[PDB]
Amino acid sequence: NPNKTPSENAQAYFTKYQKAKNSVAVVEEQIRLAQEEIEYFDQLIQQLSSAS
RNA sequence: AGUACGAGAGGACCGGGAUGGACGCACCGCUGGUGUACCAGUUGUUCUGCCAAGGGCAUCGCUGGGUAGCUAUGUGCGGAC
């Protein structure tokens, strides 16, 4: 257990936790957007790989 | 006093003790400088009739030292409480 400033280390841990829960929101949103992009790009690969 | 402070690295305020730089005031007793009526060596010519010994001139002829005085680059002291 740190450290020179004994409360700000625990407070830094608690801040990392708040950033972590905001990350739980935003990275799930980004995963949803990324699977939508991969589905659209796989479709674009299919439509480029020949047709009409 | 590696004390306070500081996670570490680092690092005191205050208070004591030495040693310096620059500047200044004195003075030679040391270290040196100079010291043209001090001592010695030595070259050329002239003179004291000659040898020897000396004198004159050649930057004090030149060279090696040097008393007193004057000196700093030398020494003592000051800006302390």
Residue A41 to residue A35: CA distance in whole angstroms: 10
What are A39's two structure tokens? 């589905």
Nucleotide nearest to A3 (CA to C1'): B7
This entry's atomic model was obtained through cryo-EM
**From start to end of A1-52, where are the E strands?**
none
Question: Residue A35 — left, alpha, or beta (φ > 0 → left; ψ -120 to 50 → alpha)?
Answer: alpha
Residue A50 to residue A17: CA distance in whole angstroms: 49
Residue A3 near residue A9, CB atoms below 8 Å: yes
Residue A9 near residue A1, CB atoms below 8 Å: yes
Place of tokens 């625990």: A10
Q: Which positions of chain B lie under 7 Å from any protein Cβ?
A: 6-8
Q: Integer distance in angstroms from CA A32 to C1' B10?
A: 53
Residue A1 to residue A31: CA distance in whole angstroms: 35
Q: At residue A28, what is the residue type?
A: E
Residue A8 to residue A27: CA distance in whole angstroms: 27
Q: Resolution of this entry in Å?
A: 3.1
Nucleotide nearest to A5 (CA to C1'): B7
Nucleotide nearest to A2 (CA to C1'): B7
